[PDB]
């Protein structure tokens, strides 16, 4: 059976275990428990869906289908997570 779907759904597992370990090494974490990665994936999904929902709202105010970087900058700016290096 060669049947499979075109749309992939396990891309939250695309944030791999050594990526989360590198993130914690940048955060200064020495030892990591085995249950950390699923919680980190859920937290990343929640944060990403919040920012992307605001960016999509900013895009469809402008009657556009393309999410620009400035919409992401405004979406991060409204929640108090202002980002430099893309505003201009």
């Amino acid at each position: 059976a060669k049947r499979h779907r075109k749309v992939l759904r396990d891309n939250i597992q695309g944030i791999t275990k050594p990526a989360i370990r590198r993130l914690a090494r940048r955060g200064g974490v020495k030892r990591i428990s085995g249950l950390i990665y699923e919680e980190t994936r859920g937290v990343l999904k929640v944060f990403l869906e919040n920012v992307i929902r605001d960016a999509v709202t900013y895009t469809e105010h402008a009657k556009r289908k393309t999410v620009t970087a400035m919409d992401v900058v405004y979406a991060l700016k409204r929640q108090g997570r202002t980002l430099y290096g893309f505003g201009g």
Partner: protein, 767 residues
């Protein structure tokens, strides 16, 4: 200089140096013979105790004392491979490599030997895979090239002659220091080639320095003794004379002969003529694709054995080994080091990787194979190769024109920088006399710079190749998906899908998917199965659903039955590998021995599939291809019929698609069936393809070695039926073949009994 502005803030001084040293962390830090490759195993460890206890399975400790394994060790030369045993090893590095070898090969070898559900096809493909593993491992024993020699002092051994030896399929990182005695007792031909390369008078330092002093080319009518080889043909000698005539005026060119004529032999002969006759024995660069590169290597080994041809692949250490052992005659000198090699063979990837170490070489000649890869001026290979300091370049291809005149303009700008100024495009819907004058100017401008030889002008034994365009009605599912996509119907497009993730970006791609098969879309099979096929899914209605879901597979099924009842083998080319999956599942549930090749298949299994399909005792009937894969090095001598399921935007891709079976030496009349959906997006795909074919027949095909008529033919729109039997106006006719098989007729009563018996036998035998 001095800062004119300062800060009045009394902030403390902060050391911003983020550089760190792990010297204080050395308390837990640091302050070569081991098993690397296991090749073969033997069932007798020390002596044959008997043939008893041949049943059951052995464990790991049972296999620790029953088998001896062939070991290639660390930093060894594949000639010191030892037949060892677990108690004869002890505790060395790489023991778990032997453990993994033992458990993996022994457990599933005895599993496939002891299972009852084993077919003969699986055991013969694994046996031939084992034999190919055996002889590719045995190939490493043969030397291929001696790099350097030295006098090394052993443990109280005075002085010993040591040779740096490269092997056949290994690279320069695996080159080893070995004794001279067994090397000269193994293959003296490579040794005497090494001493022939030692006292070399064909070095680049002993080169002619022709500055507008090109000698007049006498048109030679015989193969010179400079090329040993076999014997050059009349057209090969004509190409040699043409290339030497073109080089005699200091002009570059394109060898645009069709594939199969031996362009590699011609350019190796021209390289040898430049080496010997004109005394231009300097550094030459040849950039070839990686897949066809052994086919260049044996050509340099056979036709020009005296040349110092070197090969350039590998990781960083192998390329470093080539760089500081074989580039320079005097590599230890700090001054300007002269070259030692004559011809350097490389690929595009190492051009883009090592442009800094290869651009600072005064190249005398350049030969780029498959020049259509260079068809884009903005591609990074164009700036990688155009910045090289090369006096004379040459491009080898088969298709100089693919899509538009800008490709030819980029090619002639790579050849002649600034001399050619092709800027105007070709408008087919203009019919102007000045456009025909421009076409004739483009003809007469590149007459001496382009040499083409067709496969019908030479080797007058080729069977004719006929292509037929078949236009078939769409199904109702295809029609409703087409009108849902084109008149966007997101509520109807989701419908019964739980996810609802239908993406209507790339509308033309979705229209091509709808024209090919409705099952390409997500959540589309179950709507057909539950509503018309009754959803039982009992091995019989699914084949009927795949047959009747698309309007192309009814004609494909009729063609497969007709070629099954005759003595023919068929290849099917597709643009998308998901349609290849659809056809592969259809042929798997049909009961037809099929083979497949696409980009996901690695090269070893591709070689297995080609050798299994080209075998004289092959039970395979149909071979599926992705269109743009494998290059031109794929061998399909046993094929007869080519079915183009999906038409490409580039007609040269389709030309190389049905040219896989239509090469030199075919014993049967090659017939091509093109499957086209009616009144869909593929009709303008064929319009653009025929416009590009008209363009190639105008400029390229009429300038080898009625223009208004072919322009009017290209300007106009185009839009015993499956018989396997039989100037540019031909092969463009549309045969609207739509027999419209019935859904009930889609299943065959004769096959239905076999399918029901197979289902009853699978239910009785469970599994």
């Amino acid at each position: 200089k001095i800062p004119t502005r300062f800060s009045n803030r009394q902030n403390k001084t902060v050391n911003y140096n983020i550089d760190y040293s792990d010297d204080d962390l050395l308390e837990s830090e640091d302050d070569f013979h081991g098993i690397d490759i296991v090749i073969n195993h033997r069932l007798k460890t020390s002596l044959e105790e008997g043939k008893v206890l041949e049943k059951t399975v052995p464990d790991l400790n049972n296999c620790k004392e029953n088998y001896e394994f062939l070991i290639k060790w660390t930093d060894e030369s594949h000639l010191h491979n030892t037949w060892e045993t677990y108690e004869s090893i002890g505790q060395v590095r790489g023991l778990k490599r032997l453990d993994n070898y033992c458990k993996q090969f022994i457990i599933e070898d005895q599993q496939v030997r002891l299972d009852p559900y084993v077919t003969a096809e699986d055991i013969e493909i694994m046996d031939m895979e084992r034999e190919r593993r055996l002889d590719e491992f045995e190939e490493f024993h043969v030397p291929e090239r001696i790099i350097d020699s030295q006098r090394a002092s052993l443990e109280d051994g005075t002085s010993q002659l040591q040779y740096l030896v490269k092997w056949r399929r290994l690279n320069y990182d695996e080159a080893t220091w070995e004794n001279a005695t067994d090397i000269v007792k193994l293959a003296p031909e490579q040794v005497k080639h090494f001493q022939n390369r030692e006292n070399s008078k064909i070095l680049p330092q002993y080169s002619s320095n022709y500055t507008s002093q090109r000698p007049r080319f006498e048109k030679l009518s015989v193969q010179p003794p400079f090329i040993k080889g076999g014997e050059l043909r009349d057209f090969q000698l004509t190409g040699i004379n043409w290339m030497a005539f073109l080089w005699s005026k200091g002009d570059n060119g394109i060898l645009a002969d069709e594939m199969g004529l031996g362009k590699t032999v011609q350019t190796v002969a021209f390289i040898s003529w430049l080496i010997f006759a004109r005394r231009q024995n300097g550094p030459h660069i040849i950039v070839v694709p990686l897949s066809t590169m052994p086919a260049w290597l044996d050509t340099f080994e056979k036709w020009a054995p005296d040349l110092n041809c070197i090969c350039y692949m590998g990781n960083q250490k192998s390329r470093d080994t080539i760089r500081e052992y074989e580039f320079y005659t005097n590599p230890r000198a700090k001054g300007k080091k002269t070259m030692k090699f004559n011809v350097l063979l490389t690929t595009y990837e190492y051009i883009l990787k090592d442009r800094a170490e290869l651009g600072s070489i005064k190249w005398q000649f350049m030969a780029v194979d498959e020049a259509h890869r260079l068809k884009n001026a903005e591609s990074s290979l164009y700036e990688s190769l155009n910045s090289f300091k090369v006096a004379n370049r040459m491009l080898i291809t088969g298709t100089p024109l693919q899509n538009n005149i800008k490709e030819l303009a980029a090619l002639v700008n790579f050849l002649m920088p600034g001399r050619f100024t092709i800027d105007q495009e070709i408008d087919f819907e203009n019919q102007d006399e000045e456009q025909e004058e421009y076409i004739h100017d483009l003809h007469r401008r590149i007459q001496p710079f382009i040499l083409r030889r067709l496969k019908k002008d030479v080797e007058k034994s080729l069977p004719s190749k006929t292509e037929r365009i078949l236009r078939v009605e769409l199904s109702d599912v295809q029609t409703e998906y087409y009108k849902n996509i084109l008149t966007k119907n997101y509520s109807a497009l989701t419908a019964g899908a739980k996810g609802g993730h239908f993406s209507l970006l790339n509308i033309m791609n979705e229209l091509k998917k709808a024209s090919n098969h409705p099952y390409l879309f997500d959540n589309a099979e179950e709507r057909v199965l539950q509503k018309f096929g009754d959803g039982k899914m009992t091995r019989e209605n699914v084949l009927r659903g795949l047959i009747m879901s698309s309007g192309k597979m009814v004609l494909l099924d009729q063609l497969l039955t007709r070629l099954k009842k005759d003595g023919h083998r068929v290849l099917i080319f597709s643009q998308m590998v998901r349609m290849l999956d659809i056809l592969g599942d259809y042929l798997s549930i049909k009961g037809i021995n099929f083979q497949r090749l696409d980009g996901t298949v690695p090269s070893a299994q591709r070689r297995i599939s080609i050798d299994h399909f080209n075998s004289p005792d092959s039970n395979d009937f149909v071979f599926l291809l992705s269109t743009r894969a494998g290059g031109l090095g794929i061998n399909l001598m046993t094929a007869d019929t080519v079915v183009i399921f999906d038409s490409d935007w580039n007609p040269q891709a389709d030309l190389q698609a049905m040219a896989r079976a239509h090469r030199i030496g075919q014993k049967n009349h090659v017939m091509v069936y093109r499957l086209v959906s009616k009144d869909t997006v593929e009709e303008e795909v064929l319009e653009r393809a025929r416009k590009k074919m008209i363009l190639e027949y105008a400029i390229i095909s009429l300038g080898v070695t009625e223009l208004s008529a072919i322009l009017k033919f290209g300007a106009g729109n185009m839009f015993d039926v499956l018989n396997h039997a039989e100037e540019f106006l031909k092969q463009f006719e549309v045969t609207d073949y739509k027999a419209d098989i019935d859904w009930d007729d889609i299943i065959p009563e004769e096959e239905l009994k076999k399918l029901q018996d197979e289902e009853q036998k699978r239910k009785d035998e469970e599994y």
